[PDB]
Design a protein around this ligand. Structure first.
Ligand SMILES: [Mg+2]
Ligand SMILES: [Mg+2]
Ligand SMILES: [Mg+2]
Ligand SMILES: [Mg+2]
Ligand SMILES: [Mg+2]
Ligand SMILES: [Mg+2]
Ligand SMILES: [Mg+2]
Ligand SMILES: [Mg+2]
Ligand SMILES: [Mg+2]
Ligand SMILES: [Mg+2]
Ligand SMILES: [Mg+2]
Ligand SMILES: [Mg+2]
Ligand SMILES: [Mg+2]
Ligand SMILES: [Mg+2]
Ligand SMILES: [Mg+2]
Ligand SMILES: [Mg+2]
Ligand SMILES: [Mg+2]
Ligand SMILES: [Mg+2]
Ligand SMILES: [Mg+2]
Ligand SMILES: [Mg+2]
Ligand SMILES: [Mg+2]
Lengths: 38, 118, 197, 147, 202, 98, 61
RNA sequence: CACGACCUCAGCUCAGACGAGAAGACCCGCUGAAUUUAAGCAUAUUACUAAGCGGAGGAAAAGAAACCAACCGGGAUUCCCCCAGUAGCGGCGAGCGAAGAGGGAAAAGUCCAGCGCCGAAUCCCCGCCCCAGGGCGAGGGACCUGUGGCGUACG
RNA sequence: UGUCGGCCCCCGCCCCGCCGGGGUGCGGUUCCUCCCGGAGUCGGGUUGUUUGGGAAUGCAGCCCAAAGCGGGUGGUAAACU
RNA sequence: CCUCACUUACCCGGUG
């Protein structure tokens, strides 16, 4: 059942934490550091 | 332990039941006490300062009797698995090295400052 | 199904072949990809040749490729020993080595020993430190005139040497070529039945 | 393309070129080579005699490089050398004869089909037929064998 | 000493080993089907398969119900053609030793199956001792000669036919005997030989 | 007067053969003094398998053909049956010598 | 973020830090060999890399 | 007849870690059909497919020969071209069907066990001293039922 | 948009040079000596399956059960070579 | 080969 798999696969919901990994990946999973202040 | 008494144990395994006498084993460890391997607590003082000894381990005593450099080999009786020392009495007999079987692999281990020496 | 004279066709399309159909639409894209990989590799090994280590000259096995030579896998340990090159230093200077190959004849052995000697003369070795030129390292003059070698390292030449026109000897004209092969075939079949005597 | 297709001129015609009585259906006689012995026997026997049955011995691991033996006839024997070479030694028929190594050109056996020009020639091949050799011997020249 | 242990284990029908196999197969069937051994019963065979006396190498004794593989069909009803009516004389494609190491690696998810060896047999049981490795112990992660098993690519290698016992069932190897698994697996070869290579210019 | 043919007993392109030491892998399975000492020692510790023990019973009553058919049924190949029967005969000969 | 700034300063240099103060890169990334363990070389390949490393060379033709 | 050593086996919300699920196009290990074709049909075919189960990674698997070959010999693996709809398999019916060589892409090789030398020369934990890289503790363990160095078919 | 044009802020690879903590020599020997190997595994029988593999390609179950100038392979079963 | 014995394999029953 491809339709049943389509309705409840990853990406059909919020992806509260997986969408953040997508944003963190494009920056190299940078942690601990902060942008240079003004 | 009772199954070892019901079944016919082959002589290559039953040979470890006939161990050394309590009087003979007492004086045997008195001589081996003067050749105990040096502990690491005292071996550091031998290095930072500025010899016959026992050779433990079944792999060491095997190449020792093969080269007939061992003057006396002491085998334990409760070695499990027994295949580690099944060949030892026959190996020491063919090579002409006197071998004895004492009771307690732990007493051999305390002789070399470890848990169990084979 | 058969209408008139024609071949008995056998199309192997009785499985689910539509699930396994590889289209070559990225064929010109993998040519650009493989080309960029050679260029990217060439910069990483900038002084060293991009084609890799020097390959030996081997003979193709079967009788169909009898007279054909080919770039082999690696130089035999015997070929390195006859050239004064250690086993574990040949990889450091870009010489392909494989220990599986053997030399069944001296023609193949002498052909690669000369190839190894010709390579070591054309080899410009840089010192491990520029401030310390050691023995095996080349001179400071040849280091400046040392560029990356494109193409195969010492491509194999197929010398099309021609037998010179000789005068046909009278003993050569009396050679029965058909009878020689016909006797060789017959003696090779009756060889075992003759050894029983 | 589809511009010159026959289906473009069958628009409007009902049966689309497949008959009203006997319509075009899904395999009215079987799929593929079906019925080759029962109802397509006449077609198989008339156009493919020998299609059914076994003949000859089996060779399990047949390697085509073992039986590789390319042949060449005597009419194309001088094609392995340049035309000027064949002419230069025609004016010198008193012993200087060219050598045509057939092995290095890609052939093993030499067959005596065509006629050979009246020139002595040394032919090097792995195999020779009886008539190819005697035509080389008759025209002058030897048949050197090679392995 | 280890040389005499392997030659001693080759005389299995001798009264010396026949007694040991008799009394150990009895003891092994009094424990649970899955039971951790305190030390290898075969130190010679364990070292030969990659076992070391470091911290992180554990041994698990597995008792598998030996014999064939009965087709799990209800009342032997395989609805189909008579070729598939076999319910009894069906043999598992994977070895019994592979079932034992796959059963020890499933119960111990935090460990990786290194190898396995034979310790006993019976008319109903085959006993194997599996060598497992704690890939997060510092005595193993700091040893460069064994850091390979700490990689994520070796997760449950016993369940993918990568261990010696499971890799034997794959039919791989160099030669004319193994033309079915050219290209890695047999499905990699089947997919390559059944893929219609439609070129750009054809 | 004679050229190298591609057929017959002396077939092949004539080249000088290169002689060299064999591959070290080809010494596999050669009995050393230590390997013979270990197997002869354990032979004294273990004894003989039930099929080796009863095949020597057929060898002492001069039934080498029945001893061969029995060992061939046990170990399999006929080439392995001769080597086993030859070894059991050497052991049986060394027994009656003592 | 003022409280965690003191917490990351208090647990600095400690062997065991709270889970929320540890780098949350990725479950797979956190389980990889550290840069210390990746740089570890056995004494055999330390010698193999000392005298049998690839040389810098060039070939004329 | 308690006190010790050891073995084997337990307990813990003990100290510190690990596993689980998701996804699953590609990948690995199993399991497994029948529509369908054979103008019926039972082997065959469909197909070592669909579905089912397990396990991964950015690739996986494979892999440095118990290989190919029979030659003037090739030389890990993977992929492409060709081999080749060929050898062969098959109610020898329907159908099925590789491999060696050759040409290319890419190329990189290696570690143990064992064998026997080296005073276990080895490792972990804990508590620390200096600058991820180095040391220390008459601290606790692991280990001789074998850690490390040398060394693996090319000797 | 075109100009690897300009400016600004993060960030990386490789090579070279000095200083610092850990590194430890390797080759050639028609010379001596010593050592050299993966068992319920191979193989055999049988069964099922798989394969183009056909007196059995691979795999597995059960039985048998190794050897060490041995063992495997050499596309037809077998013995000898 | 067959029968009768042995208990420790294996099997069954009882029991807090
Ligand atoms: Mg028609
Ligand atoms: Mg009309
Ligand atoms: Mg109509
Ligand atoms: Mg029409
Ligand atoms: Mg009609
Ligand atoms: Mg139609
Ligand atoms: Mg069904
Ligand atoms: Mg080492
Ligand atoms: Mg999961
Ligand atoms: Mg039908
Ligand atoms: Mg129909
Ligand atoms: Mg029907
Ligand atoms: Mg599926
Ligand atoms: Mg991932
Ligand atoms: Mg990639
Ligand atoms: Mg991999
Ligand atoms: Mg098929
Ligand atoms: Mg090929
Ligand atoms: Mg090898
Ligand atoms: Mg089939
Ligand atoms: Mg034959």
């Amino acid at each position: 059942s491809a339709k049943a798999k389509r309705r409840s696969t990853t990406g059909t919901g919020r992806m509260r934490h997986m969408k953040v990994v997508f944003r963190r990946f494009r920056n190299g999973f940078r942690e601990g550091t902060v942008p240079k202040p003004r | 332990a009772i199954l070892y008494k019901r079944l016919k144990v082959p002589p290559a395994i039953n040979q470890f039941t006939q161990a050394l006498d309590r009087q003979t084993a007492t004086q045997l460890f008195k001589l081996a006490h003067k050749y105990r391997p040096e502990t690491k607590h005292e071996k550091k003082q031998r290095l930072l300062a500025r010899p016959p000894v026992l050779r433990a381990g079944v792999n060491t005593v095997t190449t020792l009797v093969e080269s007939k450099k061992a003057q006396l080999v002491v085998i334990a009786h409760d070695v499990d698995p027994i295949e580690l020392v099944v060949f030892l009495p026959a190996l020491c007999r063919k090579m002409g090295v006197p071998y004895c079987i004492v009771k307690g692999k732990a007493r051999l281990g305390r002789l070399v400052h470890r848990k169990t020496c084979t | 199904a058969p209408s008139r004279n024609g071949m008995i066709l056998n199309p192997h399309f009785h499985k689910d072949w539509q699930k396994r159909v590889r289209t070559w639409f990225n064929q010109p894209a993998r040519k650009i990809r493989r080309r960029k990989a050679r260029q990217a590799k060439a910069r990483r090994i900038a002084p060293r040749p991009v084609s890799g280590p020097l390959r030996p000259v081997v003979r193709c096995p079967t009788i169909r490729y009898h007279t054909k030579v080919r770039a082999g896998r690696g130089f035999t340990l015997e070929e390195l020993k006859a050239a004064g090159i250690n086993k574990k230093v040949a990889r450091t200077i870009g010489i392909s080595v494989d220990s599986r190959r053997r030399n069944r004849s001296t023609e193949s052995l002498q052909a690669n020993v000369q190839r190894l000697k010709e390579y070591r003369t054309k080899l410009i070795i840089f010192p491990r430190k520029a401030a310390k030129p050691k023995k095996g390292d080349s001179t400071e003059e040849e280091l400046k005139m040392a560029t990356q070698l494109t193409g195969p390292v010492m491509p194999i030449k197929k010398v099309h040497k021609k037998e010179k026109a000789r005068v046909i000897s009278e003993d050569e004209k009396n050679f029965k070529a058909f009878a020689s092969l016909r006797m060789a075939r017959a003696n090779a079949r009756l060889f075992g039945i003759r050894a029983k005597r | 393309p589809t511009k010159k297709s026959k289906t473009r001129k069958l628009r409007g015609h009902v049966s689309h070129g497949h008959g009203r009585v006997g319509k075009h259906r899904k395999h009215p006689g079987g799929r593929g080579n079906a019925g080759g012995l029962h109802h397509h026997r006449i077609n198989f026997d008339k156009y493919h005699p020998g299609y059914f049955g076994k003949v000859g011995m089996r060779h399990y691991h047949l390697k085509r490089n073992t039986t590789f033996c390319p042949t060449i006839n005597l009419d194309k024997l001088w094609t392995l050398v340049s035309e000027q070479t064949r002419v230069n030694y025609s004016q010198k028929p008193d012993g200087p004869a060219p050598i045509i190594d057939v092995v290095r050109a890609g052939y093993f056996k030499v067959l005596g089909k065509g006629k050979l020009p009246k020139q002595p020639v040394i032919v090097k091949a792995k195999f020779f037929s009886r008539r190819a050799e005697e035509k080389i011997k008759g025209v002058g020249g030897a048949c050197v064998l090679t392995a | 000493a280890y040389k005499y242990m392997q030659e001693l284990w080759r005389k299995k029908q001798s009264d010396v080993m026949r007694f040991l196999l008799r009394v150990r197969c009895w003891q092994y069937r009094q424990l649970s089907s899955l039971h951790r051994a305190p030390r290898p019963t075969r130190p010679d065979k364990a070292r030969r398969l990659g076992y070391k006396a470091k911290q992180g190498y554990v041994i698990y004794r597995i008792r598998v119900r030996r014999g064939g593989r009965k087709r799990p069909v209800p009342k032997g009803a395989t609805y189909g053609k008579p070729v598939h009516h076999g319910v009894n004389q069906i043999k598992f494609a994977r070895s019994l030793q592979s079932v034992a190491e796959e059963r020890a690696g499933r119960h111990c998810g935090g460990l990786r199956v290194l190898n396995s060896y034979w310790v006993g047999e019976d008319s109903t049981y085959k006993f194997f001792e599996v060598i497992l490795i704690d890939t997060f112990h510092k005595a193993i992660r700091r040893n460069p000669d064994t850091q390979w098993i700490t990689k994520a690519v070796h997760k449950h290698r016993e369940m993918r036919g990568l261990t010696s016992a499971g890799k034997k069932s794959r039919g791989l190897g160099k030669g004319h005997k193994f033309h079915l698994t050219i290209g890695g697996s047999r499905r990699a070869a089947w997919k390559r030989r059944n893929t219609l290579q439609l070129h750009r210019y054809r | 007067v004679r050229y190298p043919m591609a057929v017959g007993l002396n077939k092949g392109h004539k080249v000088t053969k290169n002689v060299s030491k064999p591959k070290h892998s080809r010494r596999r399975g050669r009995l050393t003094k230590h390997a013979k000492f270990a197997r002869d020692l354990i032979r004294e510790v273990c004894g003989f398998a039930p099929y080796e023990r009863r095949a020597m019973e057929l060898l002492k009553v001069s039934k080498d053909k029945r001893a061969l058919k029995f060992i061939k049924k046990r170990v399999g190949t006929h080439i392995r049956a001769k080597r086993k029967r030859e070894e059991l005969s050497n052991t049986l000969a060394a027994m009656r010598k003592a | 973020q003022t409280q965690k700034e003191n917490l990351r300063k208090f647990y600095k240099g400690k062997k065991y830090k709270p889970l929320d103060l540890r780098p949350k890169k990725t479950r797979a990334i956190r389980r990889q060999l550290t840069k210390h363990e990746e740089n570890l070389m056995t004494k055999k390949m330390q010698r193999k890399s000392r005298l049998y490393s690839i040389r810098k060379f060039a070939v004329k033709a």
